[PDB]
């Protein structure tokens, strides 16, 4: 909404390399926050004895 059509092509070319550069500087490690599960429970043998 600002630049003339000639400048917007140069802005778009640098923008398209920008999007793929944020692709590179994100990574895809995963598989550590997806394989954890809600597995918590309590157990024990507690009693009052004489």
């Amino acid at each position: 909404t600002v630049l003339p059509p000639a400048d917007f092509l140069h802005a778009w070319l640098r923008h398209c390399r920008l999007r793929d550069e944020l692709d590179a500087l994100a990574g895809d490690p995963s598989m550590l926050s997806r394989n954890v599960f809600p597995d918590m429970r309590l157990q024990g043998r507690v009693d009052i004895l004489t």
């Binding site: 597995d39 918590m40 429970r41 157990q43 024990g44 043998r45 507690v46 009052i48 004895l49 004489t50």
Partner: protein, 49 residues
């Protein structure tokens, strides 16, 4: 009525006190320290049969 008070007091509570209150007369479970043993471990469920 003082004469009746003397003989009635000597008739009801005349001898020694009847309530013995002594540990051997009490039940045998009155000499322990209430042992507490165990755990409330909170672990995960196993992931293999």
């Amino acid at each position: 009525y003082k004469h009746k008070f003397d003989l009635a007091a000597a008739n009801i509570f005349g001898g020694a006190v009847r309530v013995d209150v002594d540990l051997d007369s009490m039940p045998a479970w009155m000499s322990e320290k209430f042992i507490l043993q165990g755990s409330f471990s909170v672990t995960t469920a196993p992931y293999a049969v």
